Amino acid sequence: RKLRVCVATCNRADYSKLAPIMFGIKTEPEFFELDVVVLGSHLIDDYGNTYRMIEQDDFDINTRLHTIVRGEDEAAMVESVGLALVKLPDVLNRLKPDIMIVHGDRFDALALATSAALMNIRILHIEGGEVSGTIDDSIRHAITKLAHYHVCCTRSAEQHLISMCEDHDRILLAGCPSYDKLLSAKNKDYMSIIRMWLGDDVKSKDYIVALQHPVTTDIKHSIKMFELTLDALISFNKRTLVLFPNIDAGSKEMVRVMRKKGIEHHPNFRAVKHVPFDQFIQLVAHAGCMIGNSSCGVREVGAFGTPVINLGTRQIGRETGENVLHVRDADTQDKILQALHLQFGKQYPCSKIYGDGNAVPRILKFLKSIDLQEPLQKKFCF
Amino acid sequence: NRKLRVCVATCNRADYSKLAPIMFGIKTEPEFFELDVVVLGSHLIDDYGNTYRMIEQDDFDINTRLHTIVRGEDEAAMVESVGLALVKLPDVLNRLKPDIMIVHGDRFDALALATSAALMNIRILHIEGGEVSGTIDDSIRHAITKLAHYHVCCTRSAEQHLISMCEDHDRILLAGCPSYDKLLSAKNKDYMSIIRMWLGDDVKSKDYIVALQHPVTTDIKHSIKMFELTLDALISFNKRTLVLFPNIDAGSKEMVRVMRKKGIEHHPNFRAVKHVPFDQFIQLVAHAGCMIGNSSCGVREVGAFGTPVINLGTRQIGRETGENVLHVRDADTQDKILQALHLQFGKQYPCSKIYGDGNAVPRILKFLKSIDLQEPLQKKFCFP
Amino acid sequence: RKLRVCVATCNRADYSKLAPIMFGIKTEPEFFELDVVVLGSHLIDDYGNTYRMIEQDDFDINTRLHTIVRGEDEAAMVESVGLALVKLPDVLNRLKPDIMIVHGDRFDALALATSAALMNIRILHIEGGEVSGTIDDSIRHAITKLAHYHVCCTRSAEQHLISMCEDHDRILLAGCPSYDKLLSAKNKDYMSIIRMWLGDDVKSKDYIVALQHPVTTDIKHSIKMFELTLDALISFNKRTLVLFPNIDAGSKEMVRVMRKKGIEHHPNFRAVKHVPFDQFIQLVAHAGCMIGNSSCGVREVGAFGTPVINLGTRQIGRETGENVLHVRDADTQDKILQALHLQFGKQYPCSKIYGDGNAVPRILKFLKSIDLQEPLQKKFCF
Amino acid sequence: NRKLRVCVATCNRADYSKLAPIMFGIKTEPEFFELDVVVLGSHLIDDYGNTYRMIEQDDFDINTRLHTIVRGEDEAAMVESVGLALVKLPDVLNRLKPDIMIVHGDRFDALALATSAALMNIRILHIEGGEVSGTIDDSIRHAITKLAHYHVCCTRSAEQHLISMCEDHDRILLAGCPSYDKLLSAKNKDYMSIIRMWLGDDVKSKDYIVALQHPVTTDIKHSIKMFELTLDALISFNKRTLVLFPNIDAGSKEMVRVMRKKGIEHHPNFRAVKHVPFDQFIQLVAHAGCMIGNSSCGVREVGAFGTPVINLGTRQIGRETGENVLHVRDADTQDKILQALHLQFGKQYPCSKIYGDGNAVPRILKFLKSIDLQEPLQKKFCFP
Ligand SMILES: CC(=O)N[C@H]1[C@H]([C@H](O)[C@H](O)CO)O[C@](OP(=O)(O)OC[C@H]2O[C@@H](n3ccc(N)nc3=O)[C@H](O)[C@@H]2O)(C(=O)O)C[C@@H]1O
Ligand SMILES: CC(=O)N[C@H]1[C@H]([C@H](O)[C@H](O)CO)O[C@](OP(=O)(O)OC[C@H]2O[C@@H](n3ccc(N)nc3=O)[C@H](O)[C@@H]2O)(C(=O)O)C[C@@H]1O
Ligand SMILES: CC(=O)N[C@H]1[C@H]([C@H](O)[C@H](O)CO)O[C@](OP(=O)(O)OC[C@H]2O[C@@H](n3ccc(N)nc3=O)[C@H](O)[C@@H]2O)(C(=O)O)C[C@@H]1O
Ligand SMILES: CC(=O)N[C@H]1[C@H]([C@H](O)[C@H](O)CO)O[C@](OP(=O)(O)OC[C@H]2O[C@@H](n3ccc(N)nc3=O)[C@H](O)[C@@H]2O)(C(=O)O)C[C@@H]1O
Ligand SMILES: O=c1ccn([C@@H]2O[C@H](COP(=O)(O)OP(=O)(O)O)[C@@H](O)[C@H]2O)c(=O)[nH]1
Ligand SMILES: O=c1ccn([C@@H]2O[C@H](COP(=O)(O)OP(=O)(O)O)[C@@H](O)[C@H]2O)c(=O)[nH]1
Ligand SMILES: O=c1ccn([C@@H]2O[C@H](COP(=O)(O)OP(=O)(O)O)[C@@H](O)[C@H]2O)c(=O)[nH]1
Ligand SMILES: O=c1ccn([C@@H]2O[C@H](COP(=O)(O)OP(=O)(O)O)[C@@H](O)[C@H]2O)c(=O)[nH]1
């Protein structure tokens, strides 16, 4: 009897780490049935219609759900969780999954975990034990408590889950699946990918990738920091790919910052919503430096030794190699402009903290090991 | 003095018994607190006894009422109910502009409230945090703990569980359960005329049973079978029995059907009721011959009167209980349950105080005033 | 190319008139594909889990939706319409229907019509031109305006649609599909159906079928009328099948009326949620009389000449034969008890106002006639 | 005197231009009316210009704000938006306890409002009822008419349409459009400094174009193509052009993308804007060289100033228009549109008053006071 697996994807931020697993599951039809659910940001033009990435990977999408309430603020974030919760249960009764794969720390993943847990559907939670110093910590660890099975990416994440009283029998230390793609990365014509996304006259290691997200707890500070960050980038004046923000609450106010600085119509800048993951890896792997507060900066790019400037409070407490320079109180242009001079064009050693490149096969085994006779979470309090 | 704006949301009598004392406390100190009350969930539902009325009869001004329950009385409907609260609450919370929100317990409804507050940067005081009940409710309770910024637990073991789950000890208050404020202040009026109202004219103290059994959502077909056998035992044991309708939504109509097909609703020996007012209910359980089923009251509250208890099934496995509680986990035959009734009916145990000292509310009011309004962000104490 | 037809059913009240069409469509696989959606009351124990009727007719249910908000009042009725509207669009994008069949005048049908119309899906509205003197008139006629194609049951209903400025080219006068079953009704052992539902010692034409619904506009009056109606039935003291109410708003207060009169535990009464349509036809066809305010009383039972007492304001303005006695101001027990003496055990001639028994084949032709090149409603104002 | 409790819900600038005058009227007579304002829909959305601010700047106390729009900018999202209003409104309406609710127009949002009021037995005054625009909006408008208990129409032909649709003539008031209260009272201030603010420093009266084109939801790919050609014409015709973003949700982002890829947002000849305040907008269109697209303003309002209009496509087919409007239904090439621009740009027509006399509001206030509060149930005049 095949294991019926449902994977729900809501944003490129999970799709980069779930697609490898989906590919793994699909390559073994003898042990697994796969149903894919697309919801959230994927269906939204502002976010780059990233459901197309799923279509271009040739996955049959069973179900599409509009689950985002418009407003781009905290109220809307909450209403979005509620919208997924009214819409999902009937889809889950139809699909009748044995287990559901949930990734990460976003509001959307809490909806998925909640709906599965309350309907007695097993949950495999990916990227569980980590620390990022925002509201996301809260969400991540609340999902951990709902989830029946856990897949973490580091030893320190494993120990955190065990410290949080999770059953060690239900934890698998696999590595991040993104590393399956990073450490298997086809450097094709990487120059023609640099030329596509940054411009014709750009040379390897001579450009910046800028990706900064609002922190929902302090939008007014997120605005001010982003202004100063752009001012620095303008002064530093080397070719810069600016990704639009990808946390919803505060997002339009951050986009307005870019608009009023003329970033959208500037020779030095390229404003984009989403770069396909395989192309994005090549971009960050050959970047002069990366700046902002993406998880990519602190978790992924270490693999290529790309210099990183991590700004603000998001990612405080994450494990990072020598390549990452933190500037918490990025409260002036000078501080940020300095960090750019220090880091731009350096080369660090290649780290492997968040993965060994064989996460997926370990995960597939862990899924086959699951015997279908209980379920109820056990909480090791002593 | 800038007053602390406190919003208390109540969804079910199961939280209202433990929140009402706090609401009374807050309301008695207008100089330090502003109070807004939000009523949602089960309270607005006839099947559950229109228990919003209990709030009206306590004289609280209800600011807002929200229909948040999706009909269906199954797991899908439970989930859609959480979602319905989440689409409805944020605009109410932006209007009310609370500094802190009080959330109680382990039910699906409390997870909606915690979620909405946490994602909108509203502070959360979570009541009854560190306990263990061995159902899906453990999961929910502990997920709420993680969202919540401030914690009020009822026992030392609950406090240690929160600390073991990596919560900041600075944000934990060990107060006791607020229900004990009412239990240990329970001035037994004419308790006989309360027995007569609810059980019948000819019933004597310690000669009746209070039966309160809830479905476990994880295994409804087993909940059904157990309840059938439980009623069969109660019919054979044949002493006057107050049967409270179930009060977990998923599986509820199938449990009600069990009662209907056994003729419990029209039987001389039984009284089928949705809700007994808390003050009257305390008197009922305090003088009962025994209590049977899987209520939290059985394992947490009635110990205070030494009332014998039969706890059936998997719900409440792992809760702290005094000598008054007899567990029958595999209640898989009528004989086992009928035996437990013979053993326990009419006994008297010593009065325990595990879940409270009777001064929870004043400790809570102080803890609320102590909160300085400059951060917020939860701290997670990860000792390796 | 086959016509993709979606039929959504929400309540037994539409299912009695849609099932015949569904059967017709399913019997012609060469011209039609059928997808069935079940939602609303069908999934609710209080209403008799009537999705089972759909399962027992062997229809493959594609999708099930929980769309009812609990509360059994007007607010809940509205929230229920809204719940269907958030849940349906993604189902309709998946099913990709060419046309959707909507029946009747209930809040649920307005949700269906609204969602179809705003998504450019064609609508065939069944039972369009009629008059019943409650809020339902409003709803029925608002659905008419959304709907692209109309199937009415009488000539007077056809003229009403034309008077309301509908295009006569898009109206089909077919008859009510319920008449396909009424005028083809297998009287099997009808006595053993009487014995099942009323009791062992009951003789044909010596029992009452009581079916009274709350009027949402005046619940307090609905309560009082129902009390007096039951009091009359108790005094008249002939075996009575009492169907629980089947309009949601006010329903629990009406059920409470029955409970406090001891109707549920009385030798003379049988309280039931739903009698299967085929069995119900036999019951009403052989009844001594029928009482209350069902549409069955004024539209269907005329076919058997069964005496009818229509109480209150619901059904004022419906077309009725000689068999129906109206008592609008049923404001005392005596008036109702009198109406019972007058009507119980009489036999009227068999009328055919609402159908000829060939509605379905006419409808199937009308569906095949639809050429798939526009759509936009035309409003004949002159 | 028991005051009439009036709730006005506003969802979009498209209703707010015609409801604000009534809200002002009601607010100026506190002795006869209590007013509660509900803001929902587009008003709370940055893409639409945060137009709740227009309500704040008119000094109305907003009782309630509701996020009711589902994101997606397509037909599915439009429907889910209606549903979202329907789950959120009933608890607000039970709280506000209105005697009557004012609903305007033909948009998906107004159907939610009408539905919720009608099913809760709240009386409805529907504004702008009897008109014809040849899209799905006809369907919506006429479905709202059927729900609504009281009707306020703007023309004699609209009145006859309502009567032909079997509405009770006793419940129809022919008032005029309230927008005309503002148009015919439009004290032209420094209109040049308003032209300079919105179009640029060097622009002269009657030498600019106002372009406002909305997608038709029934045929988005055709809406796209038409808009491309329209912009190409405007680029060739090369006179200063205010381009308003689209204001029908379904298809909106694909229309915005058209503008983006033509470089309209960064062109000397164009100014891309979301919303111009109504009072300033009147001055813009009153002095425009011509107006182009498919706004209702083009066919209903600007006639008052004799401003030339080009109405493109199927939206507005069947509306009553003066000599100032040139229809180009099959705008299928750039040449056809460029021609229409040459023909119309800079002309001056006579001032028409088809949609109003400028005293709509006072007639409406009287009609509200006339309502006696003893029924309600709609009557449907079915003459055979
Ligand atoms: C600039 C560039 O190099 N390429 C084009 C990009 C690029 O292909 C994608 O971003 C890839 O993900 O696409 C285009 O542009 P794009 O689709 O980025 O849209 C840009 C506009 O979208 C608004 N925006 C952005 C993010 C967000 N969360 N909310 C928003 O409202 C901003 O106001 C901004 O002006 C296109 O397809 O139309 C056109 C652009 O020219
Ligand atoms: C039985 C009794 O002793 N007293 C009365 C009780 C009692 O006072 C209250 O329940 C107290 O909370 O009230 C009445 O009856 P009550 O309100 O209990 O309604 C009885 C019916 O409720 C249905 N039910 C209950 C719970 C649930 N989850 N779903 C349900 O469908 C059952 O079908 C059952 O028949 C009353 O108010 O009308 C009338 C009863 O006679
Ligand atoms: C009475 C009888 O002849 N037969 C049985 C009927 C019958 O089979 C069905 O109604 C058929 O549709 O079924 C049973 O009973 P039933 O399922 O009707 O449930 C009866 C109880 O449901 C509550 N109710 C009813 C309608 C409504 N809208 N809301 C409600 O809360 C009432 O309080 C009432 O007490 C059964 O299956 O359990 C048991 C009954 O014994
Ligand atoms: C252009 C101009 O003349 N003035 C400014 C305008 C203007 O004052 C207002 O629009 C008036 O309502 O405001 C600004 O710009 P504005 O708020 O128009 O934002 C421009 C961006 O909005 C996106 N958009 C618009 C509508 C829609 N449905 N979806 C969208 O994604 C487009 O991508 C577009 O690039 C501002 O407030 O920041 C800044 C602009 O510079
Ligand atoms: O244009 C992009 C930008 C990011 N990413 C990937 O998307 C994921 C999430 O990055 P993002 O900044 O969107 O969210 P965060 O991880 O910072 O929460 C990471 O795996 C990135 O490698 C991508 O594929 N294309
Ligand atoms: O008729 C009743 C039955 C119970 N309770 C109280 O309801 C609360 C919750 O009991 P329930 O069994 O409904 O929920 P649980 O706590 O078991 O989740 C406890 O404080 C009980 O003492 C009450 O006030 N009246
Ligand atoms: O037990 C019943 C009662 C009614 N009906 C049928 O259900 C439909 C609706 O009747 P109801 O009173 O439920 O609603 P109404 O038509 O009065 O709005 C009619 O076709 C009846 O013949 C049925 O099949 N079984
Ligand atoms: O910048 C603007 C553009 C339009 N309008 C007014 O908005 C209303 C609706 O116009 P729109 O084209 O947005 O909607 P429509 O009426 O076309 O549905 C009309 O009264 C316009 O005069 C406005 O006040 N400011």
Residue numbers in the entry:
A (entry chain B), C (entry chain B): 8 to 389
B (entry chain A), D (entry chain A): 7 to 390
Quote the passages of the study that discuss this structure, keeping the authors' original sentences:
The crystal structure of the epimerase part of human GNE was determined at 2.7-Å resolution by single-wavelength anomalous diffraction (SAD) method using Se-Met enriched protein. Each asymmetric unit comprises four monomers (denoted A, B, C and D) in two homodimers. Only UDP was observed in the active site of each monomer despite the use of UDP-GlcNAc in crystallization. Therefore, at high CMP-Neu5Ac concentrations, the GNE tetramer assumes the closed, inactive, conformation to maintain the favored interactions with the inhibitor.
Sialic acid biosynthesis in mammals starts by converting UDP-GluNAc into UDP and ManNAc, followed by phosphorylation of ManNAc at the sixth position. Catalysis of both reactions is carried out by the bifunctional enzyme GNE, which in human is composed of ~720 amino acid residues and divided into the epimerase part (~400 aa) and the kinase part (~300 aa). To understand the mechanism by which CMP-Neu5Ac inhibits GNE, and to find out the difference between non-hydrolyzing and hydrolyzing UDP-GlcNAc epimerase, we crystallized the epimerase part of human GNE and determined its structure in the presence of substrate and inhibitor.
